[PDB]
């Protein structure tokens, strides 16, 4: 991107960048790696309420495990940002946003479906695929 400010600032400082783009609005906290680890572990604790054989709980477990791994090999907090395509602050806000909808999911219990549940899926086949070759 291009800064629209005539003033000259250094965007490799990795803090002047965050101040310029307004990440501080998202969270006033610094957003270090340990905070991300704590947030992921708190999400893992929270999803315990969801039944063990629930696809949603398995999904959250898999995502949290993937992100805890990405924290594992990468000792640099910026490296985690590059791998996850996000600022550490918004990665931390992500788990809280996930926490917000757990009550709404525990009220309706979407995972309860009969053992004959079937969702019909219709898929589109493009003519370019067939016409050019088979």
């Amino acid at each position: 991107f291009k800064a629209v400010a005539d003033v000259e600032i250094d965007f490799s400082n990795r803090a002047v960048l965050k101040k310029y783009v307004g990440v501080d609005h998202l969270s006033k906290e610094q957003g270090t790696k340990a905070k991300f680890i704590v947030s992921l572990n708190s999400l893992l604790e929270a999803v315990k309420s969801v039944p063990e054989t629930a696809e949603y709980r398995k999904a959250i477990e898999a995502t949290c495990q993937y992100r805890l791994k990405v924290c594992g090999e990468n000792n640099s907090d910026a490296a985690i940002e590059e791998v996850l395509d996000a600022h550490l602050e918004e990665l931390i806000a992500e788990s809280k946003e996930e926490l917000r909808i757990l009550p709404v999911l525990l009220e309706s219990k979407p995972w309860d479906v009969p053992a004959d549940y079937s969702a019909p899926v219709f898929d589109y086949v493009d003519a370019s695929t067939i016409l050019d070759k088979k």
Binding site: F1, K2, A3, V4, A5, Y20, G22, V23, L26
Partner: protein, 395 residues
């Protein structure tokens, strides 16, 4: 046994009527104000609701293109572009490269005039009238390009399904290139009068503050997103034409105030100039409309020499093409934000449902949150940054 504390009451339910130094169109605004400070803003719309969406249902697809030009009178090309893209997606029609280049070029041109009008009319609303008149001469130079390609300065109806209506007239590329050679200097002249001016700074700084979360929540797009720190552009994130080839950088600011969005719009004009130069240099040669004559009209000599071409001409100018049953939503980066058309086809020659997604509708919805705690004078500036067009808001 601890005393309770009472509060104060707000009155002054003003009615702010159609008012000339504001975003163009008719705005009826009901404002509840505690003293000189606003507590609620309720925009009253429907004053330019012409029933466009229902009228589209009674017209053929090619007959409904001029509706999109008149939805937004500032940016016509971008508005008709989404409609033609949606019809092309449903029809599975491939646009030739020269027509794709012509569409991108004229889209950038209309983007530039939109930004010129927005900035200079906003300055006029503040009370500075010199940038405004300094800008009309540039806007005339660009209207002259439109009248050259289409014969209409405003409602060209130049973009068509599968390409463009006619080819670029000889000598146009040179003239556009000259306007481009001088455009940057003209923009710098305008920028000095606005930027750095203490009264302009005081009027615009820290007014209309928006945060990224608020923008996504309210569905805002374009300059509002980019003035708050969001690196999101449809031309880059979701390319729709030869925009992917084009090399340009997103302008980003972080504060979200009125000034940041003004700076973003100026830089957007500069980026559009860069895209135009690339379009001019890389303009290909060949067909400007799709070779298929079951979706595009035949050429006049061809209709006058061939039976199949006369048949195709007759059936395309009487019945029109039949669009296969399906639904699609195609969005384009309009100068005011994201403009999209949700087209539902049942297999006939007329659209069954054509929903128009207004970029300015959500901004006018955001007006109340933004204009809380402000003053009667700040409303004009806040409306200016939203840059709302009420024919565009009221379809």
């Amino acid at each position: 046994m601890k005393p309770l504390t009472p509060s104060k009451v707000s009155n002054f339910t003003i009615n702010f009527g159609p008012q000339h130094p504001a975003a163009h169109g008719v705005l009826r605004l009901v404002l509840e104000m505690d003293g000189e400070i606003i507590k609620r803003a309720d925009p009253h719309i429907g004053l330019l609701h012409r029933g466009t969406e229902k009228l589209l249902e009674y017209k053929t697809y090619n007959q409904g293109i001029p509706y999109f030009d008149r939805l937004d009178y500032v940016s016509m090309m971008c508005m008709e572009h989404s409609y033609v893209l949606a019809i092309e997606q449903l029809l599975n029609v491939a646009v030739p490269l020269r027509g794709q280049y012509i569409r991108v070029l004229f889209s950038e041109i209309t983007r530039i005039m939109n930004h010129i009008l927005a900035i200079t009319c906003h300055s006029m609303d503040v009370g500075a009238l010199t940038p405004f008149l300094w800008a009309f001469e540039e806007r005339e130079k660009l209207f002259e390009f439109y009248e050259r390609v289409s014969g209409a300065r405003m409602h060209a109806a130049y973009f068509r399904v599968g390409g463009v209506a006619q080819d670029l007239p000889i000598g146009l590329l040179r003239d556009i290139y000259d306007w481009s050679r001088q455009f940057a200097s003209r923009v710098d002249e305008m920028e000095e009068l606005l930027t750095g001016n203490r009264i302009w700074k005081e009027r615009t700084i820290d007014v209309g503050l928006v945060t990224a979360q608020q923008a996504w929540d309210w569905g805002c797009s374009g300059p509002i997103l980019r003035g708050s720190g969001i690196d999101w552009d449809l031309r880059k994130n979701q390319p729709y034409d030869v925009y992917g080839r084009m090399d340009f950088n997103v302008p980003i600011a972080g504060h979200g105030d009125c000034y940041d969005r003004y700076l973003v719009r100026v830089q957007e004009m500069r980026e559009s100039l860069r895209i135009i130069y690339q379009c001019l240099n890389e303009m290909p040669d060949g067909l400007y409309k799709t070779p298929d004559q079951k979706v595009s009209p035949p050429s006049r000599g061809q209709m006058k020499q061939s039976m199949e071409s006369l048949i195709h001409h007759f059936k395309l100018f009487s019945e029109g093409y039949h669009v296969p049953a399906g639904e699609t939503y195609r969005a384009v980066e309009a100068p005011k934000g994201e403009f999209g058309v949700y087209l539902v086809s049942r297999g006939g020659n007329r659209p069954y449902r054509c929903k128009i997604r207004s970029p300015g509708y959500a901004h006018l919805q955001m007006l109340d949150m933004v204009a809380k705690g402000a003053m009667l004078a700040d409303v004009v500036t806040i409306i200016g940054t939203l840059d709302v067009v009420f024919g565009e808001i009221d379809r």
